[PDB]
Each structure stands twice: as C-alpha cells, then as structure tokens.
Amino acid sequence: EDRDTARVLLIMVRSLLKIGNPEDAEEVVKMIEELARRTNDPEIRRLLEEARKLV
Amino acid sequence: EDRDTARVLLIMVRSLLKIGNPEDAEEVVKMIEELARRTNDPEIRRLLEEARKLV
Amino acid sequence: EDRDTARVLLIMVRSLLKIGNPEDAEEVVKMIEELARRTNDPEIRRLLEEARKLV
Numbered sequence A, B, C: 001e002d003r004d005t006a007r008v009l010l011i012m013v014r015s016l017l018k019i020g021n022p023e024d025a026e027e028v029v030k031m032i033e034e035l036a037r038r039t040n041d042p043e044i045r046r047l048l049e050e051a052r053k054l055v
C-alpha cells in the first residue's frame, strides 16, 4: 500500500532526526515526495508536509 | 520481496524501541499486520509474532 | 523502485550501526545483497559496496 509505505518513511524521517542525521532524513523526504507525485493521495501529501516540517 | 519487507519492518520495530519510541514501533507492527493479511506466508506470520512480542 | 529501496536500506545500515546494532546492520546488508542479485542494477551494486564499507 502506497499510504503504508509513506507512513513508514515518515517514521524513518522522525527517527533519523532523533539520531542527529537530517541529511538522511532529507533523502527520505525526497522519496515521500516522489510517492506523492506518483499517486495523487492527499494523505500522502499530508505526510509529506509533516515530514518537511520536522526536517 | 515480501519476506524481506517483513524482516526490515521487524528490525525497525526493534530499533524504535531501542531509541524510546514505542508508539512508532506499534505503528510498524500495524504495517506488518497489513503485510501478513495480504500474503499468508508462515515466515511473515512468524516475524509478525516476534515483533508483537518486542512491543 | 528498487533503487529507492536500496537507498532506504543503506540509510538503515548507517543508522543501525550508529545506535549500536551491527548485527541488524549486517542483516540489512544481506537484503541489499538479495536486491543486488535479483536486479544486477549498477547503482544498487554501488549502494551495496557503500553499505559494505560501513560494516
């Protein structure tokens, strides 16, 4: 499920920031963004914005 | 491949508990439950059970 | 995408080494190996060698 992959990637973003690695978190944000592009899901869009906001 | 996904998610569950985020770990258990429900693989079911036990 | 998956796994290798679970880090390298063998994608093999160097 596309939405499920996006929620796992958001959790990765949060954890990567917690261990002081925003450069890896930002790499994952890019994947959520391409997920939001391929689909048209406003939930995946919401997760992308939350991810960008944490980063 | 579905079994490798289950293994990756289990490692995430373990890692998230290690860094003190059981709420995110539980969310990853839910992702393994969705995987187990669309597959029916005895090893995926075994990985889901041992993730459940960490939580 | 398989390349996105390999990037996610490399990030997991680095993060797992950072939190002190080299054994899980090595398991994820194994998954990159599986991915590298199924695909023979040259970028996935590059990411594999990057992961191996960290371990």
Ligand SMILES: N[C@]12C[C@H]3C[C@H](C[C@H](C3)C1)C2
Binding pocket: A005, A008, A009, B005, B008, B009, C005, C008
């Ligand atoms: N497709 C994915 C499988 C596994 C869980 C999550 C993050 C990574 C590893 C890629 C989705």
